[PDB]
C-alpha cells in the first residue's frame, strides 16, 4: 500500500504573430477602377478586362506571398525550438534513473 | 522519325506556313520577381 497515482498539469502559452505585405495601385489604375464600379454600356470592355486581369494577377501574387512566407516562419521557429543531437543523445542515453 | 527519337523532347515543334515571307519576329516574356511576405509592416 505505497502506490498512489499522480496527474500532471502543464499549460501552454498561445504566443502571437502576424503577416503583412504591400500592394500598390496607380492613379490611372484606381481611376479606371472607379468607372468599373458603374460598368454599363459605357466603360470599354477590353480595357476593363485588361485592368481586372492585371490587378487580379498582382493581387494573387501578393496573396500567395503570405502563403509562401508561412513556411519560412514555421521552419524558422522549428530551428528556434531545437537542441543538437550531439547534446541530447548522450543525455537521453547515459542516465539510468537520474 | 525525329519525333520518335529521344532527342525530340528538347524541342517544341510547331507549324508555321507563313515563315518564308518573314523578314523578322520577336517574342516576349514577363516573369516577375517572387517575394516573401515577412511579418513586420516594413
Amino acid at each position: 500500500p505505497v502506490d498512489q497515482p499522480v496527474h500532471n498539469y502543464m499549460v501552454k502559452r498561445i504566443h502571437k504573430r502576424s503577416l503583412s505585405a504591400a500592394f500598390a495601385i496607380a492613379s490611372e489604375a484606381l481611376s479606371l477602377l472607379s468607372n468599373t464600379y458603374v460598368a454599363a454600356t459605357e466603360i470599354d470592355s477590353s480595357l476593363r478586362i485588361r485592368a481586372i486581369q492585371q490587378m487580379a494577377r498582382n493581387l494573387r501574387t501578393v496573396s500567395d506571398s503570405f502563403e509562401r512566407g508561412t513556411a519560412d516562419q514555421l521552419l524558422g521557429v522549428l530551428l528556434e525550438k531545437a537542441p543538437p543531437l550531439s547534446l541530447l543523445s548522450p543525455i537521453n542515453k547515459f542516465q539510468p534513473e537520474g | 522519325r525525329f519525333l520518335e527519337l529521344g532527342l525530340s523532347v528538347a524541342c517544341i515543334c510547331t507549324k508555321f506556313p507563313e515563315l518564308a515571307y518573314v523578314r523578322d519576329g520577336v517574342i516576349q516574356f514577363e516573369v516577375q520577381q517572387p517575394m516573401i511576405a515577412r511579418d513586420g509592416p516594413h
Binding site: 477602377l33 468599373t36 464600379y37 460598368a39 485592368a51 481586372i52 486581369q53 490587378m55 487580379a56 494577377r57 494573387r60 | 518573314v22 523578314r23 523578322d24 519576329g25 520577336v26 517574342i27 516576349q28 516574356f29 514577363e30
Partner: peptide
C-alpha cells in the same frame, strides 16, 4: 471593381509573337 472571373489558379500567361511588316 468586381472580379467577375475565377481567382486565377496558376496563371499561364500567353506567348505572343510579333512579326514585323
Amino acid at each position: 471593381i468586381p472580379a467577375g472571373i475565377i481567382p486565377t489558379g496558376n496563371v499561364l500567361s500567353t506567348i505572343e509573337v510579333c512579326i514585323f511588316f
